[PDB]
């Protein structure tokens, strides 16, 4: 019996007394009937023979069978295909499978729809009109189910918006739908509907379920005729107020919303919804749904709006986004974070279609009550959790997302301020107003969300003012609300408040706007006390404490005259936080400076040098201690990498790197131009022991840039005197120099050119001399790209300045006429972007031995141009520039010589695409 053998090796397979050989056989057995081509034979017969054969059994061939029939070819498989659907479709009239297992429907199931897959469009037209009249006729609900888990199953295979898509799979799978459309699917529907109809008055929602499951499923291929009809909308909209129907009716109708039809049709079904919510005067999933259905409705209309076309319609639709308003509030203002964002694209729609209509700014008294509950509502959402505490956890708190959020409603509150700004500002200034108010009736501790609120929003209210009409009006005096608010929030006890993130705010605020203060001094000593607190400065807070040095520094730098009584003071008070505990740690298990000084507030500690600076420089503190405050900060991070470098092998680079790079920030500190100075002695004790820190271990490529640096802001300060001693850089630096470091040089020199102009010429054309030697040879030699790319755009560079910086004369000096000929042909050799810079270089040397020469040899160069835009015309422009310095020989010796070597010579000489052409 071919049936029996199937039935021992599956039944071998079961059960586990079974040897590992035996069960090896059966196993094997059950996998033969998949490849071999007898064996879906032998199941084409036992699945159907329900009393002898044991579901177990059954399965295995229904499985085999469908592998079979999803290998199969419609044309070299056709007979062997239908053979099996009648054997199928004969099980399935039977109806006898339901009350066996589970797993022998849903085995049908995919059986059936693989089937269908292939013969249905051509060889099975009765498919659908079959299955239904079963329904019918049965009147087993079972059965409904199962004819929908099917039309789902269908629908499954058949569309997708997945990225691995195939052109054959969209093909076959859209022949499909396309013959749905146009043979089945208008009963199909009206099927669909009937029962759902049918079952929601059976008080039987566990079918009705499974229709909106598939309506909503189908919705993208189904005709539009088909599902405008409003019976159905009325239907599905009923289903609202039913609970296990409710989340898929909700669903189920966003998808009909989202339905790409055109815009008359659209507002027909909108109408019925908009109705039905109409008059319509909780659980969360539900409002989740039920928000993205309005959101749904409000894109759609108001994506609508915006190219119009009847002139009724016009209206009709502004009613309907109208009659949403209520709704797009009483969900924007939910406590949930996830029901109000599902709202946030329609609000955004909506008030960048608002925004585009405020052409006459004339508020209607609703758009005013409107816009003022939106507000209401964007309030209410920016504030943090009243329940809900923070954490300064950076990466994996939902603050993230809150930021976002916010981020978001900000963006929110902009628009309505763009909308109309003085039903903004009077509403977030009570709001900034009471919020604080309210505050003071809390204990610290409660407090503080609603104090973060008014910082945040005070924060933001007027990122984008500059000057003085900003905070107070020029005739009256009559101070804006954005400073009403600075001075209450000034004169709060916001300072007192111990919540980290109010500090931060609070400081912020008060950088932001520091020329604030220009105007209302009164409260300088306060604020400076503060950036000076345990709470500014000082914070214990390891997330603001480096905030705060960057801020006070910039508070500092904007109110620089406004303390200088308060110099001495502060100063004292930063004495701890001018130390210097570097500790090196590393996803990578290895180490590195970039690591290490990230892992530290280095970066941050650096303003708080630079700060120092600027209280010792400018704070009228008699030049007889400046010299020593200046003297013992200098000193005491210069002793300190004296100490390391002087006692062990050679973590002191990163020490090294940072003491050097202290100095160059407290450089910065201080003014840039030096009228006799205190400051300027204790600056020449400060490279001595850099040049003494240069030469006993300076073989860091960071070392090389934190000095090279410190030289850029140290000589920047007292300049005139320190040019001369950069040539003893330039040695130690080129000896050790590798290919990234030769162009930092030429940029160091370069930038330094800018600064001390006139007098850095004599030390010039002694490193041009070491310089273009070193520079030759790097470019005639792992760092190809990089050296190539880098030293070719420094060498343009570098000459170009020389020549304006009129630096050309000077080499010609003993020292540069060996090479002003390869200087000179180099640039020749270097000739887009370039040659664009090489040409305006040999046009420098020419406007600005072998001169005369090199003039002709340019001549060549412009023919040789189009032997492969700009450069086409900067080309000729050298040639135009050309007859000016040469005047009657330079086109005579072009007559004489080049034209000889007839009339685009002719039409040449009298002032390339064409000769090119
Ligand atoms: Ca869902
Ligand atoms: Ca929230």
């Given at each position: 019996?071919?049936?029996?053998?199937?039935?021992?090796?599956?039944?071998?397979?079961?059960?586990?007394?079974?040897?590992?050989?035996?069960?090896?056989?059966?196993?094997?057995?059950?996998?033969?009937?998949?490849?071999?081509?007898?064996?879906?034979?032998?199941?084409?017969?036992?699945?159907?023979?329900?009393?002898?054969?044991?579901?177990?059994?059954?399965?295995?061939?229904?499985?085999?069978?469908?592998?079979?029939?999803?290998?199969?070819?419609?044309?070299?498989?056709?007979?062997?295909?239908?053979?099996?659907?009648?054997?199928?479709?004969?099980?399935i009239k039977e109806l006898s499978f339901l009350?066996?297992?589970?797993?022998?429907?849903?085995?049908?199931?995919?059986?059936?729809?693989?089937?269908?897959?292939?013969?249905?469009?051509?060889?099975?037209?009765?498919?659908?009109?079959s299955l239904q009249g079963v329904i019918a006729a049965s009147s087993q609900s079972e059965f409904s189910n199962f004819y929908?888990?099917?039309?789902?199953?269908?629908?499954?295979?058949?569309?997708?918006?997945?990225?691995?898509?195939?052109?054959?799979?969209?093909?076959?799978?859209?022949?499909?739908?396309?013959?749905?459309?146009?043979?089945?699917?208008?009963?199909?529907?009206?099927?669909?509907?009937?029962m759902?109809?049918?079952?929601?008055?059976?008080?039987?929602?566990?079918?009705?379920?499974?229709?909106?499951?598939?309506?909503?499923?189908?919705?993208?291929?189904?005709?539009?005729?088909?599902?405008?009809?409003?019976?159905?909308?009325?239907?599905?909209?009923?289903?609202?107020?039913?609970?296990?129907?409710?989340?898929?009716?909700?669903?189920?109708?966003?998808?009909?919303?989202?339905?790409?039809?055109?815009?008359?049709?659209?507002?027909?079904?909108?109408?019925?919804?908009?109705?039905?919510?109409?008059?319509?005067?909780?659980?969360?999933?539900?409002?989740?749904?039920?928000?993205?259905?309005?959101?749904?409705?409000?894109?759609?209309?108001?994506?609508?709006?915006?190219?119009?076309?009847?002139?009724?319609?016009?209206?009709?639709?502004?009613?309907?986004?109208?009659?949403?308003?209520?709704?797009?509030?009483?969900?924007?203002?939910?406590?949930?974070?996830?029901?109000?964002?599902?709202?946030?694209?329609?609000?955004?729609?909506?008030?960048?279609?608002?925004?585009?209509?405020?052409?006459?700014?004339?508020?209607?008294?609703?758009?005013?009550?409107?816009?003022?509950?939106?507000?209401?509502?964007?309030?209410?959402?920016?504030?943090?959790?009243?329940?809900?505490?923070?954490?300064?956890?950076?990466?994996?708190?939902?603050?993230?997302?809150?930021?976002?959020?916010?981020?978001?409603?900000?963006?929110?509150?902009?628009?309505?301020?763009?909308?109309?700004?003085?039903?903004?500002?009077?509403?977030?200034?009570?709001?900034?107003?009471?919020?604080?108010?309210?505050?003071?009736?809390?204990?610290?501790?409660?407090?503080?969300?609603?104090?973060?609120?008014?910082?945040?929003?005070?924060?933001?209210?007027?990122?984008?003012?500059?000057?003085?009409?900003?905070?107070?009006?020029?005739?009256?005096?009559?101070?804006?609300?954005?400073?009403?608010?600075?001075?209450?929030?000034?004169?709060?006890?916001?300072?007192?408040?111990?919540?980290?993130?109010?500090?931060?705010?609070?400081?912020?605020?008060?950088?932001?706007?520091?020329?604030?203060?220009?105007?209302?001094?009164?409260?300088?000593?306060?604020?400076?006390?503060?950036?000076?607190?345990?709470?500014?400065?000082?914070?214990?807070?390891?997330?603001?404490?480096?905030?705060?040095?960057?801020?006070?520094?910039?508070?500092?730098?904007?109110?620089?005259?406004?303390?200088?009584?308060?110099?001495?003071?502060?100063?004292?008070?930063?004495?701890?936080?001018?130390?210097?505990?570097?500790?090196?740690?590393?996803?990578?298990?290895?180490?590195?400076?970039?690591?290490?000084?990230?892992?530290?507030?280095?970066?941050?500690?650096?303003?708080?040098?630079?700060?120092?600076?600027?209280?010792?420089?400018?704070?009228?503190?008699?030049?007889?201690?400046?010299?020593?405050?200046?003297?013992?900060?200098?000193?005491?991070?210069?002793?300190?990498?004296?100490?390391?470098?002087?006692?062990?092998?050679?973590?002191?680079?990163?020490?090294?790197?940072?003491?050097?790079?202290?100095?160059?920030?407290?450089?910065?500190?201080?003014?840039?131009?030096?009228?006799?100075?205190?400051?300027?002695?204790?600056?020449?004790?400060?490279?001595?022991?850099?040049?003494?820190?240069?030469?006993?271990?300076?073989?860091?490529?960071?070392?090389?840039?934190?000095?090279?640096?410190?030289?850029?802001?140290?000589?920047?300060?007292?300049?005139?005197?320190?040019?001369?001693?950069?040539?003893?850089?330039?040695?130690?630096?080129?000896?050790?120099?590798?290919?990234?470091?030769?162009?930092?040089?030429?940029?160091?020199?370069?930038?330094?050119?800018?600064?001390?102009?006139?007098?850095?010429?004599?030390?010039?054309?002694?490193?041009?001399?070491?310089?273009?030697?070193?520079?030759?040879?790097?470019?005639?030699?792992?760092?190809?790209?990089?050296?190539?790319?880098?030293?070719?755009?420094?060498?343009?560079?570098?000459?170009?300045?020389?020549?304006?910086?009129?630096?050309?004369?000077?080499?010609?000096?003993?020292?540069?006429?060996?090479?002003?000929?390869?200087?000179?042909?180099?640039?020749?050799?270097?000739?887009?972007?370039?040659?664009?810079?090489?040409?305006?270089?040999?046009?420098?040397?020419?406007?600005?031995?072998?001169?005369?020469?090199?003039?002709?040899?340019?001549?060549?160069?412009?023919?040789?141009?189009?032997?492969?835009?700009?450069?086409?015309?900067?080309?000729?422009?050298?040639?135009?520039?050309?007859?000016?310095?040469?005047?009657?020989?330079?086109?005579?010796?072009?007559?004489?010589?080049?034209?000889?070597?007839?009339?685009?010579?002719?039409?040449?000489?009298?002032?390339?695409?064409?000769?090119?052409?």
């Open positions: 019996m071919s049936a029996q053998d199937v039935e021992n090796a599956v039944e071998a397979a079961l059960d586990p007394s079974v040897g590992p050989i035996i069960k090896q056989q059966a196993t094997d057995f059950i996998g033969s009937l998949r490849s071999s081509s007898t064996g879906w034979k032998i199941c084409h017969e036992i699945f159907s023979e329900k009393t002898k054969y044991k579901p177990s059994t059954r399965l295995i061939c229904l499985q085999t069978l469908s592998e079979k029939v999803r290998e199969w070819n419609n044309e070299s498989n056709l007979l062997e295909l239908q053979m099996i659907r009648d054997s199928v479709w004969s099980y009350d066996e297992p589970a797993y022998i429907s849903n085995a049908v199931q995919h059986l059936l729809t693989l089937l269908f897959l292939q013969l249905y469009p051509s060889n099975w037209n009765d498919f659908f009109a929908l888990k099917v039309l789902l199953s269908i629908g499954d295979e058949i569309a997708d918006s997945l990225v691995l898509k195939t052109d054959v799979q969209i093909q076959k799978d859209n022949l499909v739908k396309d013959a749905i459309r146009a043979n089945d699917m208008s009963d199909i529907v009206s099927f669909v509907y009937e759902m109809l049918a079952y929601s008055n059976a008080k039987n929602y566990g079918t009705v379920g499974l229709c909106l499951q598939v309506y909503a499923q189908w919705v993208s291929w189904i005709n539009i005729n088909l599902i405008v009809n409003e019976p159905c909308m009325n239907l599905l909209y009923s289903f609202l107020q039913i609970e296990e129907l409710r989340c898929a009716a909700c669903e189920t109708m966003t998808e009909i919303v989202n339905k790409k039809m055109k815009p008359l049709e659209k507002l027909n079904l909108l109408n019925i919804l908009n109705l039905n919510l109409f008059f319509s005067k909780t659980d969360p999933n539900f409002d989740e749904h039920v928000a993205k259905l309005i959101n749904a409705q409000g894109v759609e209309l108001v994506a609508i709006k915006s190219d119009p076309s009847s002139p009724e319609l016009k209206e009709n639709c502004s009613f309907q986004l109208y009659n949403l308003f209520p709704y797009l509030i009483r969900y924007l203002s939910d406590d949930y974070d996830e029901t109000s964002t599902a709202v946030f694209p329609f609000l955004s729609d909506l008030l960048v279609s608002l925004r585009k209509e405020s052409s006459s700014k004339e508020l209607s008294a609703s758009l005013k009550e409107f816009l003022k509950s939106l507000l209401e509502a964007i309030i209410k959402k920016m504030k943090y959790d009243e329940s809900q505490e923070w954490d300064d956890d950076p990466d994996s708190e939902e603050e993230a997302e809150f930021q976002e959020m916010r981020k978001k409603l900000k963006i929110f509150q902009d628009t309505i301020n763009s909308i109309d700004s003085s039903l903004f500002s009077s509403y977030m200034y009570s709001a900034i107003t009471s919020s604080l108010s309210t505050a003071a009736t809390l204990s610290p501790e409660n407090s503080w969300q609603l104090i973060e609120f008014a910082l945040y929003e005070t924060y933001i209210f007027g990122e984008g003012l500059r000057g003085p009409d900003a905070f107070f009006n020029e005739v009256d005096k009559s101070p804006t609300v954005l400073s009403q608010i600075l001075a209450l929030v000034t004169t709060s006890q916001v300072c007192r408040h111990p919540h980290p993130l109010v500090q931060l705010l609070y400081m912020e605020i008060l950088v932001r706007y520091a020329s604030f203060f220009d105007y209302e001094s009164a409260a300088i000593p306060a604020l400076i006390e503060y950036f000076v607190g345990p709470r500014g400065i000082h914070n214990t807070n390891e997330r603001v404490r480096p905030r705060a040095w960057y801020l006070f520094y910039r508070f500092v730098k904007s109110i620089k005259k406004q303390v200088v009584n308060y110099t001495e003071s502060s100063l004292a008070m930063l004495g701890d936080l001018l130390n210097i505990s570097v500790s090196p740690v590393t996803d990578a298990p290895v180490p590195t400076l970039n690591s290490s000084i990230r892992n530290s507030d280095f970066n941050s500690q650096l303003y708080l040098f630079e700060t120092v600076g600027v209280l010792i420089s400018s704070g009228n503190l008699t030049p007889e201690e400046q010299a020593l405050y200046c003297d013992s900060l200098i000193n005491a991070l210069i002793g300190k990498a004296n100490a390391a470098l002087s006692s062990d092998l050679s973590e002191n680079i990163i020490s090294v790197y940072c003491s050097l790079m202290a100095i160059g920030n407290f450089a910065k500190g201080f003014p840039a131009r030096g009228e006799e100075v205190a400051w300027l002695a204790s600056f020449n004790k400060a490279s001595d022991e850099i040049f003494l820190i240069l030469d006993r271990m300076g073989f860091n490529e960071d070392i090389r840039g934190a000095v090279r640096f410190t030289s850029g802001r140290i000589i920047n300060v007292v300049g005139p005197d320190m040019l001369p001693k950069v040539p003893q850089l330039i040695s130690i630096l080129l000896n050790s120099i590798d290919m990234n470091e030769l162009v930092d040089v030429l940029s160091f020199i370069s930038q330094l050119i800018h600064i001390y102009k006139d007098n850095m010429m004599e030390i010039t054309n002694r490193m041009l001399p070491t310089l273009l030697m070193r520079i030759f040879s790097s470019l005639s030699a792992t760092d190809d790209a990089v050296k190539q790319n880098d030293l070719r755009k420094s060498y343009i560079s570098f000459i170009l300045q020389l020549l304006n910086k009129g630096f050309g004369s000077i080499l010609f000096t003993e020292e540069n006429q060996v090479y002003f000929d390869p200087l000179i042909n180099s640039i020749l050799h270097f000739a887009p972007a370039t040659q664009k810079s090489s040409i305006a270089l040999v046009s420098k040397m020419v406007s600005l031995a072998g001169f005369e020469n090199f003039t002709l040899s340019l001549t060549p160069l412009c023919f040789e141009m189009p032997v492969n835009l700009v450069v086409l015309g900067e080309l000729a422009g050298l040639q135009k520039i050309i007859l000016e310095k040469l005047g009657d020989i330079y086109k005579s010796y072009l007559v004489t010589v080049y034209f000889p070597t007839d009339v685009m010579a002719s039409e040449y000489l009298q002032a390339i695409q064409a000769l090119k052409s």
